[PDB]
Every structure is written in structure tokens, then in C-alpha cells.
Amino acid sequence: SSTRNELETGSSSACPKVIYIFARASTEPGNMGISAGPIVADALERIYGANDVWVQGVGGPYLADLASNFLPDGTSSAAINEARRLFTLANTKCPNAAIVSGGYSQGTAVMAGSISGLSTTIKNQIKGVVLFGYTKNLQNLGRIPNFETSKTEVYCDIADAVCYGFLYQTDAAVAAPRFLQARIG
Ligand SMILES: O=C(CSCCc1ccccc1)C(F)(F)F
Q1: Range of 112's domain?
Q2: Domain count, the chain
Q3: Is 105 a known active-site residue?
Q4: Nearest 5°: phi and psi at 86?
Q5: Can you give the CATH number for the domain in which 118 is found?
Q6: Atom of ligand 1 nearest to the CA of 24
Q7: How far away, in angstroms, is 66 Cα from ligand 1 center?
Q8: Side-chain half-sphere exposure of 50, counting CA atoms within 13 A
Q9: CA-CA distance, 163 to 138, in Å (whole number)?
Q10: Are 86 and 110 a contacting pair, CB within 8 Å?
Q11: Which listed residue (68, 76, 105, 114) is catalytic?
Q12: How far is the C-alpha of 185 from the C-alpha of 30, rounded, in Å?
């Protein structure tokens, strides 16, 4: 459940309802990690059908190392390009799937940096984005640059220091799936 590649591996003859793309926290294993990621993946699969959700982690060159949190974008440029690559693949393979996405900690910076740079038509296919412990919360004014704020939800705990420039279990299991579901329609 730490590694999910249903989008890379998916065929455009079998497009699902939902494509879910997740960027993990620093240090987490796989491309999904072991906290926020799998929890949102399971909630979505419960709502829509395991067969009607493609779950996809941002792996490849997104190494999730701590040092990269200090780069100007809060992550590496290769992690950002890999998330872009993946959203782009979702749109080429399945232009009608609802794309939803999530990030936890540094993955939050992968989500904000990739989405802010994508085309109008790709961003339109992204129906919802959930950010858990958003490391660029203050810098980005609680939103993703160039992406509609009604589609964005930030879970930023009062005691979460990264939010001022595992605390999110009920956010991930309960509040995030509902937010996403309200917009997948
Ligand atoms: O991916 C995240 C990166 S933010 C961690 C960097 C940091 C945390 C607390 C205090 C100083 C620096 C995390 F590692 F999951 F938290």
C-alpha cells in the first residue's frame, strides 16, 4: 500500500472515475508513504470502487529527502516535474476522470509547485487537492498559486510549525475524503 502505480500502469481503454495522485512526507517509504496517503487512497476506494480509482504515488526522482525542504520551492525541481508528468499522463490517458490529489509535508510543496505551473485544461481536470501540514502555508497564503481556492483544502494544525512559515489522522480519514467527494460529484 506504500507503492501504487495504477496511473503509470493504467490503460486508456479502462479509464476510472477518479485518478488520485499523492506526494508523500519527507522520509516516507514507497511513493505513497505510510500515513495520509494510503488513508485517503482507501477512503476514495471505499466511496468509488477499488476498480474506479487509480491510485498513484509521486515516485521516480521525488526522493522525499529532508534537505530538499530547504530548496527555494520547498522541494526539488525533479519532484515537481515528476508530479507534472503524472497529472499530464492522467489528462492524456483519461481526459474525463476526476483528478484529485494530496500532499503531506514536503509532498505539499510538490503539489503546490507542480499544479501552479500546469495548463488551464489540466488544472480544470483537477477537482480537489488536499494538503496536510502545508510547508508553504504562509508563503502561499493558504492556497496553491494559480489554482482555484475552492478546489484546495489545507489541513494545518495549530501546533504545526511548518504551517507558520502525525497530526492529521482524522483529517485524512474523515474530512479530506468528504471534501474530495463533494467535488468529484
Ligand atoms: O516532509 C516534511 C518536511 S517538514 C520537516 C522539516 C522540519 C520540521 C520541524 C522542524 C524543523 C524542520 C516532514 F518531514 F514530514 F515533516
Answers
A1: 1-185
A2: 1
A3: yes
A4: -65, -50
A5: 3.40.50.1820
A6: 1
A7: 7
A8: 4
A9: 6
A10: no
A11: 105
A12: 30
